[PDB]
Nucleic acid binder design. Sequence first.
DNA 1: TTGCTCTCTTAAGAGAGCA
DNA 2: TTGCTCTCTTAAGAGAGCA
Lengths: 370, 374, 374, 370
Amino acid sequence: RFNTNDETKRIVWTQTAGHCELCGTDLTFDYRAGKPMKWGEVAAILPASPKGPRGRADHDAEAHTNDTANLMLLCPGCHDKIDRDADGYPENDLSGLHQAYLERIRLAATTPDGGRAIPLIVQSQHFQTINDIPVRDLLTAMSAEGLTAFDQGIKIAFAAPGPRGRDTTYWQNVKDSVQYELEQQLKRRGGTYGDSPALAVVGLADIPALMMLGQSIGDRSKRLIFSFHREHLLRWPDQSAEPPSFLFTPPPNGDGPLALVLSISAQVPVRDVTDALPGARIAELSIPEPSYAMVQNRRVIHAFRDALQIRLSQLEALTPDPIHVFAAIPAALAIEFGALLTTQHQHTYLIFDRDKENQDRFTQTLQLGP
Amino acid sequence: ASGRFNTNDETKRIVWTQTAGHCELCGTDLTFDYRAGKPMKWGEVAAILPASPKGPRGRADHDAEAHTNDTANLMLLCPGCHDKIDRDADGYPENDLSGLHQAYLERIRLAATTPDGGRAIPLIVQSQHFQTINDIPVRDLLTAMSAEGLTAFDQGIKIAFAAPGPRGRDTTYWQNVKDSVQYELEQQLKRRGGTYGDSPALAVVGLADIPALMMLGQSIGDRSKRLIFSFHREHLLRWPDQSAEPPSFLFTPPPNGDGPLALVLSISAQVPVRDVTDALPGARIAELSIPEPSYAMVQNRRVIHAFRDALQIRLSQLEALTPDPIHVFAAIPAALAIEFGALLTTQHQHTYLIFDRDKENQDRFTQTLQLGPV
Amino acid sequence: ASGRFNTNDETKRIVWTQTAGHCELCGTDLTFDYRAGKPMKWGEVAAILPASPKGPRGRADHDAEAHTNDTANLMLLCPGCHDKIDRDADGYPENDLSGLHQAYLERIRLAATTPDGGRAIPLIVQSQHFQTINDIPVRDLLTAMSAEGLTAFDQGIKIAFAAPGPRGRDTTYWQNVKDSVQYELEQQLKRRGGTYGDSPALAVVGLADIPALMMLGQSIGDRSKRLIFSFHREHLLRWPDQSAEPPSFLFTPPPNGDGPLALVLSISAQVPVRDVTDALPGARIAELSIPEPSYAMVQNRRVIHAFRDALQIRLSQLEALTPDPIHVFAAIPAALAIEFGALLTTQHQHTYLIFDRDKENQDRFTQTLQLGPV
Amino acid sequence: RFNTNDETKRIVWTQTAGHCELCGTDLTFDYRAGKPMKWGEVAAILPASPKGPRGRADHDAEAHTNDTANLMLLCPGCHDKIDRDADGYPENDLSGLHQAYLERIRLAATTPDGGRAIPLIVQSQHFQTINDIPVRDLLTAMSAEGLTAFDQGIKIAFAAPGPRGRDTTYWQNVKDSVQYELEQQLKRRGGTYGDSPALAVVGLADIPALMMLGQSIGDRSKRLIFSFHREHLLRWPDQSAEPPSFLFTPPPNGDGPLALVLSISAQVPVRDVTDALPGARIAELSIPEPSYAMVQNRRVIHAFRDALQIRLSQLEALTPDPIHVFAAIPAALAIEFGALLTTQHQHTYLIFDRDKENQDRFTQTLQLGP
DNA sequence: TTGCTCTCTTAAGAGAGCA
DNA sequence: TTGCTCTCTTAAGAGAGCA
Ligand SMILES: Nc1ncnc2c1ncn2[C@@H]1O[C@@H]2COP(=O)(O)O[C@@H]3[C@H](O)[C@@H](COP(=O)(O)O[C@H]2[C@H]1O)O[C@H]3n1cnc2c(N)ncnc21
Ligand SMILES: Nc1ncnc2c1ncn2[C@@H]1O[C@@H]2COP(=O)(O)O[C@@H]3[C@H](O)[C@@H](COP(=O)(O)O[C@H]2[C@H]1O)O[C@H]3n1cnc2c(N)ncnc21
Ligand SMILES: Nc1ncnc2c1ncn2[C@@H]1O[C@@H]2COP(=O)(O)O[C@@H]3[C@H](O)[C@@H](COP(=O)(O)O[C@H]2[C@H]1O)O[C@H]3n1cnc2c(N)ncnc21
Ligand SMILES: Nc1ncnc2c1ncn2[C@@H]1O[C@@H]2COP(=O)(O)O[C@@H]3[C@H](O)[C@@H](COP(=O)(O)O[C@H]2[C@H]1O)O[C@H]3n1cnc2c(N)ncnc21
Ligand SMILES: [Zn+2]
Ligand SMILES: [Zn+2]
Ligand SMILES: [Zn+2]
Ligand SMILES: [Zn+2]
């Protein structure tokens, strides 16, 4: 009268795919000694007797015996803990975690196949804080779009700056990581992924480095860009958001050096460009409200790309000398920027960045080009 | 076409579980009957099919029975999809579906293992004063973490900022604060785990003077899996309301002139201008406020994120106007002070001078902290 | 001296468990009575004492009751040691023992958590031929791993070396072998875990031609937590005898001359010299053997380690004699071929030319692999 | 008649310190929600009925009901698995793991306090294989000698060589890791460890780098050297082994450059020294049977140190020009070698190493000195 | 040759009486 | 004011009869 029947336990195992709803462990197999076994327990949130953990007098136990909204698949340890600390694992909290777990499974089961890609994380250590993109979050963002991979992918972390800051040694190391380490790790995959597998790539690293990354993978391989967002991590903030307008101001005439100022994350003060590059003729690409949060979805990235491609060809047509780049842009845009410099734009680009060893002044770092 | 693949009931249960009970080609939930109060006829609402052929036609180019012996190579399909799969007379597909099937299984597994992505470090940071009058026990953070899917696996970190000596909150004092936090944080983020070896998430709450909270933000940054929690006078560590929409952050630009630039943040309460100009003579005041300032305004974490997004938009505008330092007079909740410090951790740095209210001098605004190019 | 500290029975149980039932000052096992068939008088054979004083004399300079409230700050002592601890009238020590007590607890915890240091990756590597005639199922490695404290947490890796095409086992072939192993190995060693975030141990067994086994050794190296397992014709993956002492590795130096230098390893069987000189005309033979060559000689893992130690001592002597390549003719078990390849992974590299017996050409010795400066 | 009594369950919890004998998890506390709870199970290896897992007709269940040799403390998941796969978890294997677990606890409980130290792991990536010293194994070797720490310590991993091999950039990076990263991480500890805490240090890294490490920590701090061993990992192979004899051959007279050849791990061929340093006058320190396995215990390291200190002063007395070092030595000896070069020996030492980019020839790398 | 039921097994926390 | 016993609770795998 109180016992959950076999059909329902089957349903509970099915709808959870046989993992513990609270810790995620696989409950269909013992990896230690190698035997398939169903070592999980079907657990009641609200108990039969009102004197059990989370018990209530107003709970019709008979009416809810085979109510899968009351039943979780738990490993025996999780189940033992939740029944020993009802105040710490209350009904509202368990039911909410239960429902959310089930919905993530249902959405994965209804996502159509969208192909395969190599996950690629590239991150620096030039910040004074930890900088770490979780692998699970990239793979989960891939999976929400139907994309899967044969392994957890490549994760490259640049060496930190040494005692002299971002000196020539540092930039040599950045280069070696992008142009040697990355390539050696793509080759070690062999044919696992094929001839030209796609790269599902997310960066959070020096702006010059990310532009170099972009240039290196631009034609080399097909690319699916993802983005780290302060609020939403690897999830796109809002798939329905419309891209902003990319405003452009052309440079003035003259012989002075040509500068391309990109004010997307923030407004780059012109005083800081003329300090670093006296006599500069400034061209500027910006959005109406510069913001760190603006990479709302992948169409924002493409629209940036489409807008900048147009203007780069224009700017190259003006001078034979390098274009000097001063950029306050999100990391995903930095990668797309470099991917445009592959062959479409074979002019020399000298990339300035903020220099903590020179009181936040812009200084020259990397040169991108033919 | 033609044949059907024989399975026993143990194999059915295993296939139904690894696929979560949906057709691998169209995604229909095959537990519909049970949800409708009808008995599950498990063998009638689904077909089980090996994912790979035996070989050319139905001619084993390999040990086909040794591959289908693995339940991992068996698919679940609704009958309509099964009927569109041409097969030989033993039930094996004529064409290979192994790629699509293994991709389906990976997507279910990544969803089923998502709870282990909650592995977390608890971190409570208080000033000696709030530790005495308003101690936050680790238990209170853990149950708030747990309700959100965050799971600690070792003791939590609870730090109390030492009070200052005679030198005051000087540069050495703030550097030892930062080192103390990053030391504990780094040792616990070496404790990787889960399915992919990811570093644990950080679950952090603070209650201290606003400049110390900003230094906690400086220490943790905003480029890692981190979740701020918030102490609330009425709801303690539980969010007052997960459905509340963030307020509008109103902004009043500074008047024009050469006086020092002040950023007044009137979020907890309305800061009077005379208190600002007493401490900073000639100040030119810019103000970020909300329509109804309130100590209780942190209804959920989206409010913290929305404050940071509006704050950063206005900081860009202000820094455009002048290279000189920005003098910060903040009436904000503790969670917003943390996120303010964390925002200011990019390579780019502008000078910010943080004014605290001196509880031992009439609550007078007092400069205790400088962030930025030094 | 004087006072005693009151504890209830729940607190006693907690202190007895966190200390494993020994005195924290002298280490005596306080469960002696139970081991002797006598009833445990838990409150008589031990004293429980806070580790830290209340303050000067027995004068709380702090909330002493708030600290002893934590059972983690309570010590277990035998009565004789307790009697040597001068105390105040509430039972608190007069002098601070917190450091010694917390160090004791850490040592017990590091021992109690030692099972999680067994986290492991299973790896089975075979040639297509041995996979067909002598497949090693993952289950057999797992139960041998488990019996030794090694615990896998995901599916094991089982690799089969592709057979060579018309180009033979050329440089490209051996590089793809190495890449294939290091690819799988690296992805699974990213899966850190346990108490400290350590990478998992590797548990590896191989059955393939000796040159391929040496390349597996080249791929895994010998500078990480790795445990070789061994297939044995009679004991399968279980060690025949954990108490067996390794045999003596006998060595016969090469005669003097200018002929090519050959290293003959007669461990599984005695290699006839004419087989060596057929393949390598003019060879100058050095030989490492054991007294009674036998296919069954890998009784335990110490035998593998002892072979490597004797082998390396003799390789140093041989390489001293000539800069020219060393030509290797090995009759050794599979586990010894793996460890031989792993030995040769330092920065220093001498040229080694490995001869295999061609099963499709009368078992003729044939050079298939070159290791070293290329 | 069959039930384990409360005294014995108490004994089982006590002697295991309340952790799962098979997975090591803490069974006295729920870290997720914060409540102390005893969530483990006292488990029988041989069961009551002979029809249970590992059952046997010849097992007197009544005689062994409170036999702690038959009872393990297990988490509920481990206990559920071992009872579902008796063939995979047989009596002999469980009993052996049980006994070993208990003995590790007893030895930790009887180890006297031996002070505190900062664990320090330093490892390179210049090998073509993974190179990774487990933290647990250093902390366990420390604990066997009574030493404990407040944290798991410092673990530095040098950047890998880039595409040019061990070039000037590589060696700059090694320097920065030893002289900047290490120091910044010792300072971040603050007063946690005191003014001059000791370093419990183990290296596995380039010989030149380890000598630089040694020179940097030699006087800076008190040092407890540990060693990675191919067979025994961080455990000392044999605490009763006697040190070998360190044989010395003095250099010949002449004006040629002075070389110090160290043949400890292996015999360094003289042909390789005269190739790199024509006209070299070779002095040699060696043991009678060079071997990778020779670091049997810490007295072997001290005896090497004592023998080399004597000879370095002699060699410095011979020339005013640098001493050129060609060394095939274990990693722990490389660290002790450098620690002697702090002030006792203020002559210039030029360190040669094997060069994979020059066909295994010795080439000059780092210069150690005043 | 399941594939629903009711008994059985194994662990544990109360509850009573007593210590 | 434990601090040994026997009942109670919750999960599960057989075992029987039948489907
Ligand atoms: N006057 C000016 N005002 C403001 N910024 C200015 C400037 N002049 C230059 N800049 C630079 O523009 C970049 C804006 O920051 P961003 O976040 O929009 O983009 C960054 C960038 O693409 C890359 C490297 O960061 P950094 O080197 O600090 O460069 C900063 C900053 O110095 O990683 C992105 N990034 C950093 N931290 C992140 C996080 N937590 N989450 C997500 N993406 C993050
Ligand atoms: N004109 C002005 N009028 C009103 N305030 C003004 C001001 N000009 C500046 N301020 C400052 O704005 C902060 C508002 O108070 P708050 O409560 O919203 O946020 C505080 C703050 O973030 C941090 C340190 O407190 P304090 O130094 O008093 O800072 C005050 C106050 O000095 O901890 C938070 N905090 C304190 N006690 C808390 C509790 N019990 N529960 C939860 N959070 C608590
Ligand atoms: N004059 C000479 N006389 C005898 N052998 C001679 C020789 N000159 C060279 N040799 C080689 O010495 C190896 C001895 O055999 P082994 O069994 O001790 O070790 C083998 C080897 O390590 C690897 C590949 O086998 P193979 O290529 O035949 O190598 C043979 C043989 O060619 O796998 C191991 N292996 C094979 N089958 C196994 C099994 N069933 N169980 C367990 N381990 C097994
Ligand atoms: N003619 C010659 N013959 C043999 N060696 C010669 C030589 N001329 C130079 N040498 C060098 O002497 C060192 C001997 O090896 P070693 O192991 O005794 O000591 C090493 C060393 O101290 C440091 C860097 O290693 P590496 O740069 O390869 O230097 C090698 C080798 O190139 O790490 C130690 N190390 C490496 N791997 C280890 C492991 N798995 N376990 C434990 N410690 C390990
Ligand atoms: Zn669980
Ligand atoms: Zn379908
Ligand atoms: Zn004692
Ligand atoms: Zn366990």
